[PDB]
Curated annotation (Swiss-Prot), chain A:
Superkingdom, natural source: Eukaryota
Shown stretch of the complete protein: 287 to 428 of 428
Protein name: 26S proteasome regulatory subunit 6B homolog
Compartments reported by the entry: Cytoplasm; Nucleus
Residues of the signal peptide: none
Family according to the record: Belongs to the AAA ATPase family.
Purpose of the protein: The 26S proteasome is involved in the ATP-dependent degradation of ubiquitinated proteins. The regulatory (or ATPase) complex confers ATP dependency and substrate specificity to the 26S complex.
PTM comment, free text: N-acetylated by NAT3.
From Swiss-Prot, chain B:
UniProt function note: Component of the lid subcomplex of the 26S proteasome, a multiprotein complex involved in the ATP-dependent degradation of ubiquitinated proteins. In the complex, RPN6 is required for proteasome assembly.
This protein's name: 26S proteasome regulatory subunit RPN6
Organism field: Saccharomyces cerevisiae (strain ATCC 204508 / S288c) (Baker's yeast)
Positions spanned in the full protein: 218 to 380 of 434
Additional information: Present with 16800 molecules/cell in log phase SD medium.
Assembly: Component of the lid subcomplex of the 19S proteasome regulatory particle complex (also named PA700 complex). The 26S proteasome consists of a 20S proteasome core and two 19S regulatory subunits.
UniProtKB/Swiss-Prot annotation, chain C:
Keyword Hydrolase applies: no
Biological classification of the source: Eukaryota, Fungi, Dikarya, Ascomycota, Saccharomycotina
Gene: RPN5
Miscellaneous comment in the UniProt entry for this protein: Present with 5710 molecules/cell in log phase SD medium.
GO BP term (any one): proteasome-mediated ubiquitin-dependent protein catabolic process
Domain called PCI: residue spans: 84-258
Family: Belongs to the proteasome subunit p55 family.
Taxonomy, superkingdom: Eukaryota
Role, per record: Acts as a regulatory subunit of the 26S proteasome which is involved in the ATP-dependent degradation of ubiquitinated proteins.
Post-translational events: N-acetylated by NAT1.
UniProt name for this protein: 26S proteasome regulatory subunit RPN5
Amino acid sequence: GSDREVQRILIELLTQMDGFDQSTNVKVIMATNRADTLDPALLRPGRLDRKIEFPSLRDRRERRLIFGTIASKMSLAPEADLDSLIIRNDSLSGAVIAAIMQEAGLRAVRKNRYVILQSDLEEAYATQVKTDNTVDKFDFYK
Amino acid sequence: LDLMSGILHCEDKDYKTAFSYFFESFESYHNLTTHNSYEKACQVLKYMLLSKIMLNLIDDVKNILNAKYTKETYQSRGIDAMKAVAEAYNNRSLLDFNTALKQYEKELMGDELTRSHFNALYDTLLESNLCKIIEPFECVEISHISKIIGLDTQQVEGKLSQM
Amino acid sequence: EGKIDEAADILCELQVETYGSMEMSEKIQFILEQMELSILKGDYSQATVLSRKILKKTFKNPKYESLKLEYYNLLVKISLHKREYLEVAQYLQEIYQTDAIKSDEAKWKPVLSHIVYFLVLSPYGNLQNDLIHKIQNDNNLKKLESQESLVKLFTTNELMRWPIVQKTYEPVLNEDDLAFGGEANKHHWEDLQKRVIEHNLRVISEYYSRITLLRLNELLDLTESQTETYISDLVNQGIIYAKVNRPAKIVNFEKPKNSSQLLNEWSHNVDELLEHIETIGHLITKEEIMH
């Protein structure tokens, strides 16, 4: 019986969403991690003509912007350049960049320097390599 | 394509986004053949420095300057202008800034983009000096003010008339 | 040898690594010795890193009381080089709280003299205040008078004069070593000059809304030019705010107050007068019965 309730909310939402067109108020903005849950015919342009794709390949310049925000927080050690961090990332997204910087300054606190060493970021970057290796794959996909 | 986006924001007085483009061209140039593109790297290196001076970060001048090739191949008279001005700006002395730009008059002359932002620099670092000056004084002689900034007496007068 | 610099480095490189096999008392001991070497190296930042390795909390225990005392002795050195007068003060007070130092007569003598010089050597302001009365409360301090006359002068807002204060304390406290008595400490005697005059400024600002610039130059005992520079720094750092007039007519110590604030305040003085009458009336009742 409790499926039908989920269904009530859903239909009532479609009817009014189509009908909210040509108000002053920006139309409903919605976010979805996966869109296989959505049905493409019902929810559709015209409700929702602007459909934003978020990349994850990124660029050398797109990443650079992120590293700057990080670097402001605490002056990077002069062990090696600002420009070192930039080279090691090759396509990764911001989310990973953040996990890297978080580990790095944790280990920084132990040494008693508040500056994050450029070595630390190097080790933290290097790690997180796992993500189903090549052994399993290569025995029957290669 | 990247360098043009960089130049366009650079004039919009944004120096983060501008920087990202000018660095993205620098790298392309190196791995390109040196038929002319060694020479076009020198010019792009100035605008990389230029963005960072305006942000008044001199950590990042030093990170950019390195023993790989900037100080070897891509080392030029314009490169000297950019680091001397950078330190004078850090020092926060409009006197030193004027003193560096006297002998780098030809560098300002050949670089239109350089000359525009250097007109701005004049005024911004003037203010930074000025806000300190007028706090512990009321009815201070303009002769006295002109010593602190390091500028000419007359020149001081005229600038304030705008401020 | 002259390879003294290379020697310091080797010994630190070993011991930065955490070990568990060394007893706690031994590990702590060995770090004190590393720190020592970093003073003679002259790379002071390294000594500061070594200090932060071990925890001050752990030292409290009466066993590590001895390690406790030496630890804070070393912190004096790193701080004193960099003429961070405030930090020196802080360390010296921790030495005093040691049980050993407080109890033995002789042991507090030099330490408490040091506390007084360094409180005076840090800029005046608000921070000093919250500290200086924790030092005042202490009976051992009250025994000495050579030191006491220095702190209480600086505590009172009573005006004093530099080239005369200097003489009073010249053959006594200028001649106490590791304070002013050392060679590079002579220039900390000289630095006291600045302290004495900025203090007199700080007080004079509050009391005098307006005082003539010429008068100020005689009180401060310095040429007009030096005087002009010290007012400017004190405004920047914002304790006071002031307006100085260049022909040298007046220096008008004031932070200006707006018409709205001055008017808001006027209503309140009036409210308090109305209360004053009302109270007296109950007491008139009482007094007629009393006789």
